[PDB]
Amino acid sequence: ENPKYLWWNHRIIPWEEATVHLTDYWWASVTAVFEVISGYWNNAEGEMYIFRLEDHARRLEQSMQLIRMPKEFTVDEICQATIDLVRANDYRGDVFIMPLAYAVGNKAFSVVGDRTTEMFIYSRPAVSRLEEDFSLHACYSSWTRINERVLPPRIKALANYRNSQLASSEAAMNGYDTALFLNPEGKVAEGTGSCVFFVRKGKLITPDITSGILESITRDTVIHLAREVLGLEVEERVVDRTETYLADEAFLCGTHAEITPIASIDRHEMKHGAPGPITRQLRDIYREVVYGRDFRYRNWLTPVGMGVR
Amino acid sequence: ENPKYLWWNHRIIPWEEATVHLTDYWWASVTAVFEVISGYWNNAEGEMYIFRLEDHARRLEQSMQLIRMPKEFTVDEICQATIDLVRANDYRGDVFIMPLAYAVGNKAFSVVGDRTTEMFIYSRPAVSRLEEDFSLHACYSSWTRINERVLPPRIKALANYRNSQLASSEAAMNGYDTALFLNPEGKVAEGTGSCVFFVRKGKLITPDITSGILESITRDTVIHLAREVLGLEVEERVVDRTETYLADEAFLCGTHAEITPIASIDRHEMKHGAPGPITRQLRDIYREVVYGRDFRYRNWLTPVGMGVR
Amino acid sequence: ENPKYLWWNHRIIPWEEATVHLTDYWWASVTAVFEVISGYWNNAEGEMYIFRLEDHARRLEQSMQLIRMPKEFTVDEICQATIDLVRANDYRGDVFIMPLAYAVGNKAFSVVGDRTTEMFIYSRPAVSRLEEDFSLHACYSSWTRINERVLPPRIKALANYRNSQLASSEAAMNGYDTALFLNPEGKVAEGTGSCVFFVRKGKLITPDITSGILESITRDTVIHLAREVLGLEVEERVVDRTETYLADEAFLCGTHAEITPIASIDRHEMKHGAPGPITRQLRDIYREVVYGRDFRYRNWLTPVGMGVR
Amino acid sequence: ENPKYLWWNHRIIPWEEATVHLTDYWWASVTAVFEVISGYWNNAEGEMYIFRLEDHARRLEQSMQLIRMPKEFTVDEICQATIDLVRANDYRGDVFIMPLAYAVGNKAFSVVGDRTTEMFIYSRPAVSRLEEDFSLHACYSSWTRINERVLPPRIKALANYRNSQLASSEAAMNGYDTALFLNPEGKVAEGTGSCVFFVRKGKLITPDITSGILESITRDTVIHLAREVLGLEVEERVVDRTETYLADEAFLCGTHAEITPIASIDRHEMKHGAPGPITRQLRDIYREVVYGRDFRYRNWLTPVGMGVR
Amino acid sequence: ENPKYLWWNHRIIPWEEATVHLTDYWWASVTAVFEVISGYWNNAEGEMYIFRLEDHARRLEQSMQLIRMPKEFTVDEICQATIDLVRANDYRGDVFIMPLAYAVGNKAFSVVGDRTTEMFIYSRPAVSRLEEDFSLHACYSSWTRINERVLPPRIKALANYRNSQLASSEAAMNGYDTALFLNPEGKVAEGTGSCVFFVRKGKLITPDITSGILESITRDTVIHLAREVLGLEVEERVVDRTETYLADEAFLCGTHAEITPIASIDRHEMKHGAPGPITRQLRDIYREVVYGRDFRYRNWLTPVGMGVR
Amino acid sequence: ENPKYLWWNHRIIPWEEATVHLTDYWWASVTAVFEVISGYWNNAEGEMYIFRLEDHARRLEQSMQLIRMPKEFTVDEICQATIDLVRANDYRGDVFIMPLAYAVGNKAFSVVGDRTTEMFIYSRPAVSRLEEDFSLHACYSSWTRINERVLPPRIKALANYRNSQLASSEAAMNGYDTALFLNPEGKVAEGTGSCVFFVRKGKLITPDITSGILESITRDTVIHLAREVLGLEVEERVVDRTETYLADEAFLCGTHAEITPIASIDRHEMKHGAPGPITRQLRDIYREVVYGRDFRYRNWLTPVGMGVR
Ligand SMILES: *Cc1c(COP(=O)(O)O)cnc(C)c1O
Ligand SMILES: *Cc1c(COP(=O)(O)O)cnc(C)c1O
Ligand SMILES: *Cc1c(COP(=O)(O)O)cnc(C)c1O
Ligand SMILES: *Cc1c(COP(=O)(O)O)cnc(C)c1O
Ligand SMILES: *Cc1c(COP(=O)(O)O)cnc(C)c1O
Ligand SMILES: *Cc1c(COP(=O)(O)O)cnc(C)c1O
Ligand SMILES: [Cl-]
Ligand SMILES: [Cl-]
Ligand SMILES: [Cl-]
Ligand SMILES: [Cl-]
Ligand SMILES: [Cl-]
Ligand SMILES: [Cl-]
Ligand SMILES: [Cl-]
Ligand SMILES: [Cl-]
Ligand SMILES: [Cl-]
Ligand SMILES: [Cl-]
Ligand SMILES: [Cl-]
Ligand SMILES: [Cl-]
Ligand SMILES: [Cl-]
Ligand SMILES: [Cl-]
Ligand SMILES: [Cl-]
Ligand SMILES: [Cl-]
Ligand SMILES: [Cl-]
Ligand SMILES: [Cl-]
Ligand code: NA
Ligand code: NA
Ligand code: NA
Ligand code: NA
Ligand code: NA
Ligand code: NA
Ligand code: NA
Ligand code: NA
Ligand code: NA
Ligand code: NA
Ligand code: NA
Ligand code: NA
Ligand code: NA
Ligand code: NA
Ligand code: NA
Ligand code: NA
Ligand code: NA
Ligand code: NA
């Protein structure tokens, strides 16, 4: 049912002790920023591998800085709390860890910088799909993606998902599995919760970060693996909508989405299938990396030894 | 300390019974919409007057519809729950009532329409400033207001305040009391939490609703009282930034802000002071209306008889 | 099968004589502008009534002027050619008349002003739905409406329908009957082939012409009939997307669309149904006008006497 | 006078057999997409060389896919039909071949995907200017170029030329030979019918494809020849208006425009003349390629042997 | 040759005494704001009439406030200095008076608020064209008008004319007499130095002030005279480009431009000529007002008695 | 006090001879363009080094061409006049030289191309800060930077500083030392008078020129020295606002600003200080270059031998 423990404001406590009032933190949620961090269980080694833990903890500290939450936690403390909780929960399987930071005020509309900074971290069992061949049908939304002018997508804020839900609602009631966004200038931005890649003529193409997207750690991982293991050309550039309809392959990528193939966009089918050949190679490489079976990428992994069963 | 009771999912319960897990509803908060409703205590009558209760309950139902929360509550139930809670709390003074509606999912990123609709209402003591002459110094923010393209301001969503906090943070660290917004086209929109009025040459001027603002009930109340009691011309139109610097008077208005005078905007002083003469007349008229001493506007008030002490 | 005749370049000819080469006029079609004009057959009088013939002929002359087609035809000639063809075709039933003007060049990319101006007019049986209660489900498109910057919607050009087809394709493959457009600023513009009206709180609301819409003769007719026969308030203004979702009623209007009720927009249902009460009154008034049974609006009708069977 | 034959819907027929009704296909023209393909006659070899035939046929298939025309023709069929028609016409000189694809509906406003796909191909004598030194005076138009938001320039649609004609009309009545466009953001896009290059400080500069331009085969050819034969730096980037006024050289390029020098832009003269030195080298290289006298680029040519007179 | 006197920094001095260094005030000119005020000589009365002197002096004080020039001069002082200089110059004919205010700094880039405020006023003979029937041919520029985002057009700043000169240069080298501007959204704004009016179907139409135009005193005068003397409908609204091409009449208006008829716009001719009938009535009414022969508008005039020769 | 001489319209004259009327050139200032050129005095050599004199003179000639000032001066004449004036002034210390070109008309609003071109050059003692460690606190302005649509930033026009002063006024009254600008699309552009650099993860980042910035000679110098002397990666790209808040270092650069460290942006502190390590290396390299003690960059220097005291 529930995990054994969670971390809250510098301490690990039993789950059933973290009880709050219904009315606590609704205003704090407007400030809230989060990470999603993966743990992958290698039963042959008896070790959990936490993927790019310090990169996620540094992004959370940056998101907190841009919200203007007062300084209270460190990068090393968030990394250590993640290790400690995965160990103490004693769950030997794939997990998601979610730090969530929030600033709490004396008044509903006090400025963030006058608030108190708080954080919890919780870890729960996750289901990987990296050993499954599946694909989604996407649409481009009639809703526009937030930009730096109004709500910087660089900040991994809960509030940014209100714009996401406009698109994901539309996609589901219009017969699609997932939405892609255009930015205010009309250029391809990202999915509702992950970055998008395209494959055309043996090249990987992905929107550049100033297209108004979150600076994904999975996106970075995929560009590295595509260049260094497969020797592919990867272009980070402005991407137009109609060119994506002619993509040989396409996929979403994100800590939660892992590598998720796109079969079609607005009912234009990816010519080489889903997962396409290059997608399938990147999915297999990614999997072997995160489960600790690719020594070349060991510096991306934080092992937590727990015992081999 | 705490109110005696609150309302939750169709029931009134003692405050200390509304306990939840720390991890409950963070994802639901992305969906959340709310109202702020005023109760004004008339000790001479022993009655609380709840201001434009049905208008607030209908706006909440509209906000919920635009979020796409499944149907669960009615306008009449939200009006009745507000009356019941103000009575049962037995607090004989000015109050704020806040309904907050949220949709809760099986998964973090399930579409809103597959969720369950929930709501609470809580009522707490409020401090009116309608018998005080005070004023704020405003700036125009370097952050842009959300528009219909990305996050419709018509929806009174918690998430819309993330954009608000960009502006209110900037205002406070730059020596101002409050921020005003420009819309993406560069035209004057609203404050961070209330609508803005200007007075120039004996006329009231306010941004039209398609300038990208919340359709305020206080804004509506002020236009009615300005036209019907004072016989003023009121223009709802596109408003430019530099014209506001030459305003004779200016004020913010909102359920929480009541009528809040603006002394200056980007260090251009309102020529007729703050509160200016027309501002002061509207503030006095508003006060007499909401405290039940203006029979002409009785249809805006819901009395809750509680006993005269 | 085919009509008896058509009009071409100042002459009426038998249908089967208007034969051209497959390769003729493809480049001319880029220039082409058109009207759709209704004839309504009153069997009790033995008369066809052609609706607002001179207004349609003047709009065609304006469209031709803005294309910069050399002067060749007159308003009176287009009105007379329409009368003559409806008479000579000897078809005693409702019809559509379509003038189509085009400029033909010596070279593919010669400037319009160096071309020759040509025109045909043809008339075919039409099916009215004014005695039927039906409704469409609409979406807002993810494709943006053309504006004055790139392709003025005031010009009733064939080429403007390429932008229309982006929206109408999307609507049909996404489970809808019809698309509505947003303009580049994000404000409600028009349908793919007709103007849109909304009814809310007993008022009619329609986008103002500078929202980037064709200046519809049906739109003008509806505003006149709503004000003069029903005494309704009609606002021509900037209209936001989410406000339309809360419309009590909505309808499309156009020479071809007559008065077409909208039941829902992006799966938000019009609260008072489709056709709603005000829609149903305007549809009945419109019908009685165009079939010549409303003496008040006789100056909008051009009778063509043909014999009462 | 007329060519002997043309191709229509999978068949070659004598020209005078391709007769249609005046009223046929005006609505189909809104859907229509086309290619312009060059044949260059080498009298010393008795061979026509058709330039980048498969690239043009693949672009036509992509344009047809983005229109959503049902599948009916193949890339190989369009390549073969082009060869067959050039041979059967027995015209031993430079030619233009124009495929034109169109979708035909039961009703005026049926969705493209419910239509029937049709196509013709015709070939006519062309005049090359590759052995002539000439130049055009250009202006930047006051009309804006279509973008992906409203009418994707990637689609080689007849309708896109309505926006072209706004600019080319203005240029001719204002004393210029040709118009250049700015995109909605104000950046340099393309000519009315061809891409634009600039030369400054020995470098070639051209707008990147996401500046909102057609992905020209001549543009691709010029970048290849500039890099591979001349060893020039070529930048594909965002280009500003005023920087173009300081260009040492400039030229238009396109299947129809071949390589067309620009002497001046808004009455700012290209400092190194027109054709400038680098322009003149690219024009001479291009010519030798397309007439089959550059063995290095033979894979771009489809020979059609016809006999050496 | 030169006027006898000018006013400078609170004093009238002989012209030849106002000598400065070549290097003085170039940086101050970036700050500079001005008015153009008309004096009209009535030889029958021996009086100069200065038109709407206080309105011009109040606009100058507002422009100075928005620049943030320190307070140094008053509205009454600028009105009195104008009277005094017109009298002391002893020139009995039509004149232009130009106040020019500037802030002077210790350093090139010191902030305006740390500078010293200075002003001169000079008066010179002017030529009225109010007794002449003439007309200009206009174009719409390919250059965009400044908006509130970058350079508020409400401020009558010298620097705003750099944007004007982009348009007026283009107009003259392209064969036109004058340029009109579109705003960044593509809507009609103003001329390079005056506001624009259109006449269509017996109504006057002019861009609303938030279209991004200077709040002209001549514009205000024309709307008053059109409504009050002619009983015309005047619409201040958003105006589209192509609708202006169909105007029956059009004219520029401004203190310097008086009432200047427009014969054509982008080679679309105003149907009722130039000056058209309504234009000609407004020109005659304006003239009789400013020369002091319309008692109804006497409160707009400041007489300066000088002697009747 | 004053320099001995200045250059004016092809001649050197004693300072006190360059006297003009107060009313001369205010309209000419709208046209005016300028350069700021540095002279650095090396007392050990008895030589002034004028930095990138020909690059500055060529930019001035380009600015003059884009204004459309008639041809009157040459690049070589402006270079020679600068040398001559620095020599004749006999001032042995660091100097600023400012050429200022202006077009003078017969009438206030004559087109620039009908005017006369004039120019002066003056040289004055300057204070270098290259031997000082200092830093500025910056904000991003609520005012938008001019773009190519309205006032091309490529032109180094006095009028462009009116937009600058909106930002620099706001910065000073809001407690900051200096303002940075966002462009109309919301991307980082430049400072009020200089370009901006960022350092993050050992890389230099600066907005690309089409972000709407002046093509700075100091910017070019810094990119050259960073790549060639330090071996740093330098990215010229679109830059987002929030990424700049996370910069390790930042600095302004310009002929007047030399290399000016930024300690903070909107109260986000540059993590590695100000001047940071890479900033400090570039400042020291720049200094040694301009004072003639780096033989590698001698071709950037124009020596003027004056005698070693
Ligand atoms: C979190 C997130 C991503 C993916 O980031 P990773 O670091 O790869 O998990 C992409 N888009 C959005 C909107 C996100 O919130
Ligand atoms: C709630 C709110 C207002 C004021 O609305 P009332 O109905 O007058 O309380 C104004 N602006 C915003 C952004 C709001 O959230
Ligand atoms: C023709 C048309 C209409 C309707 O115009 P009527 O004069 O009412 O037929 C509306 N929208 C568009 C795009 C049209 O082409
Ligand atoms: C066809 C076309 C071009 C040139 O394309 P090529 O493949 O080089 O012929 C350029 N611009 C536009 C708008 C076009 O239609
Ligand atoms: C001064 C000016 C006008 C006209 O203003 P009046 O008060 O009528 O002289 C119009 N447009 C611009 C840009 C101006 O500078
Ligand atoms: C002059 C200037 C700069 C710096 O240019 P340098 O050639 O380095 O002096 C930067 N920004 C603006 C706006 C400028 O006017
Ligand atoms: Cl809270
Ligand atoms: Cl540990
Ligand atoms: Cl990499
Ligand atoms: Cl939840
Ligand atoms: Cl009750
Ligand atoms: Cl009212
Ligand atoms: Cl044709
Ligand atoms: Cl007749
Ligand atoms: Cl009406
Ligand atoms: Cl057809
Ligand atoms: Cl063959
Ligand atoms: Cl290449
Ligand atoms: Cl100065
Ligand atoms: Cl006096
Ligand atoms: Cl009036
Ligand atoms: Cl001058
Ligand atoms: Cl010398
Ligand atoms: Cl370099
Ligand atoms: Na701890
Ligand atoms: Na498809
Ligand atoms: Na490791
Ligand atoms: Na209940
Ligand atoms: Na002030
Ligand atoms: Na009541
Ligand atoms: Na005829
Ligand atoms: Na619904
Ligand atoms: Na009639
Ligand atoms: Na065949
Ligand atoms: Na020139
Ligand atoms: Na070949
Ligand atoms: Na005085
Ligand atoms: Na004309
Ligand atoms: Na008077
Ligand atoms: Na000289
Ligand atoms: Na800080
Ligand atoms: Na040198």
Numbering used by the authors:
A (entry chain A), B (entry chain A), C (entry chain A), D (entry chain A), E (entry chain A), F (entry chain A): 6 to 314
What text comes from the article?
Generally, the active site is a combination of two pockets: the O-pocket on the phenolic side of the PLP and the P-pocket on the phosphate group side of the PLP.
When Y101 was substituted for phenylalanine, the side chain of the latter oriented almost 180° away from the P-pocket in both variants and accepted the conformation induced by both the R43S and G41V changes. Compared to WT TaTT, the mP3 O-pocket loop lacks some stabilizing hydrogen bonds—between the backbone oxygen of S115* and the side chains of T197 and S173 and between the backbone oxygen of F114* and the side chain of Q170. These disturbances induced a shift of the loop, and thereby, the side chain of F114* shifted toward the cofactor and partially blocked the entrance into the active site. The triple mutation in the P-pocket induced a significant shift of the loop accompanied by a rearrangement of hydrogen bonding between the O-pocket loop and the structural elements forming the P-pocket. Consequently, the α-ketoglutarate binding sites are disturbed in mP3. Moreover, the side chain of F114* is placed in a potential position of the γ-COOH group and can prevent proper binding of α-ketoglutarate.
